[PDB]
Amino acid sequence: STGSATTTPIDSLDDAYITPVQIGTPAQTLNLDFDTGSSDLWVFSSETTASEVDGQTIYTPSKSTTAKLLSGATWSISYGDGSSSSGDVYTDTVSVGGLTVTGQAVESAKKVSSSFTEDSTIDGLLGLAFSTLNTVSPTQQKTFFDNAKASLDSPVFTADLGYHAPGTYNFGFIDTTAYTGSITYTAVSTKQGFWEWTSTGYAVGSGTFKSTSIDGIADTGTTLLYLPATVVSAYWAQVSGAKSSSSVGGYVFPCSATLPSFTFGVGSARIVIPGDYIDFGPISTGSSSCFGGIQSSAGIGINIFGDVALKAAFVVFNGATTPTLGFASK
């Protein structure tokens, strides 16, 4: 089997991408944030504290003839941005782009943190990291991909995120018309539960490529590119007037600037992020100070190849017995 679904930016900055997901019978379609940095499929629901729902579409398990309470199971998650959610668990039928999993754990939120409430466009998350990170207790549950992978034509999914435009998540096949050149595959460590890999270096604009190993994660659920402070300083030094602002929370730059590209290495291959992809717009409405799309990971503990980097590539998440990642230009 295969599936293919369009993923759509939630706003004009590409802050996140939503993908329609069918849950239950009859289908209830929710727009979920596919997140290769986490491993829970959780949704706003009829159980979510009413004051914490503000415009999201909810899953109502009582209206699904295939929903079953997973007795005794609870979940609770905290993300790298400080947001969180928790609740109980149903199993139900879940379909993405024509690919159906029966008995998928659907984690129903009883509580969500304010950042989720305040984002009416995201009805939940669909985790695509390794199932070892799933938070369901006392019996950990499998991700959608883990449940589907034996049925898929090939045990892979691909992320083709758009710049200011829709893109595609495919399951079970590699669309050879969706990229240029060849796909370069690189090793993955699953020891932390992430799609963790090592970039071979970077370049700023037309500058020389610096060969240096940069360990990080491929994370579709993180907006920006978070890299070591040395790398980030080298980038922003090429933007007149750019500076790190402790009050804003990162590098800002004059909105009048033209940003240079940023290149990262995948083996001997190179992925070029155009300068425009690094512009996240005014820090507040009407400001001439703009927020940068490349930020320091120093306070995180891990480097993160988020959407800024991934949207410049066609990305293969190869879930073979020994997982690997593939990157192609497009």
Curated annotation (Swiss-Prot):
It comes from Cryphonectria parasitica (Chestnut blight fungus). GO terms for biological process: proteolysis. One of its GO terms (molecular function) is aspartic-type endopeptidase activity. Residues 17-328 form the Peptidase A1 domain. This is Endothiapepsin. Keywords: Aspartyl protease, Disulfide bond, Hydrolase, Protease, Signal, Zymogen. The gene is EAPA. Transmembrane segments: none annotated. It catalyses: Hydrolysis of proteins with specificity similar to that of pepsin A, prefers hydrophobic residues at P1 and P1', but does not cleave 14-Ala-|-Leu-15 in the B chain of insulin or Z-Glu-Tyr. Clots milk.
